[PDB]
């Protein structure tokens, strides 16, 4: 066992989500011009 049985609350008894990402792929698409 471990202390992350708190995440065994995060089974069935969990529903929520918010996020914001995709800044590195912006640089990888600014870097879509030269990769070699």
């Amino acid at each position: 066992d471990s202390g992350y049985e708190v995440h065994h609350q995060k089974l069935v008894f969990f529903a929520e989500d918010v996020g914001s990402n995709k800044g590195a792929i912006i640089g990888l698409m600014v870097g879509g011009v030269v990769i070699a």
Partner: protein, 127 residues
């Protein structure tokens, strides 16, 4: 965002019924009360709602720091404007929230003269 008055967090928009009037909470003069650990509540400020019980912009929406605060349909100050004696300036009742995340239901109180439960048309978990 909306400084002063706005509805970003949806603070209050609902259909209300009255106990003695059978109508939405028409122009409720508002005293906001705050639950303490010894169950008693203290007044905060003053206002007057809409016909549907809606009062906004007591303070700035985001500059107002969060806490045990309320948009209460207060029996003490509203029913004073009608000249009938109220009893519930506040009510020492328990309330529980926020086990695994916040939702949107604010305490729109039952307009009864001496007392209040909470009256609102209930909405589902929705962003």
């Amino acid at each position: 965002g909306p400084t002063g008055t706005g509805e970003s967090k949806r603070p209050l928009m609902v259909k209300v019924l009255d106990a003695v009037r059978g109508s939405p909470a028409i122009n409720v003069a508002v005293h906001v009360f705050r639950k303490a650990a010894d169950d008693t509540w203290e007044p905060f400020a003053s206002g007057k709602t809409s016909e549907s019980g809606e009062l906004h912009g007591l303070t700035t929406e985001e500059e107002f720091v969060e806490g045990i605060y309320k948009v209460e349909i207060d029996t003490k100050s509203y029913w004073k404007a009608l000249g009938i004696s109220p009893f519930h300036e506040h009510a020492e009742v328990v309330f529980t929230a926020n086990d695994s995340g916040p939702r949107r239901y604010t305490i729109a109180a039952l307009l009864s003269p001496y007392s209040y439960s909470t009256t609102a048309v209930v909405t589902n978990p929705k962003e």
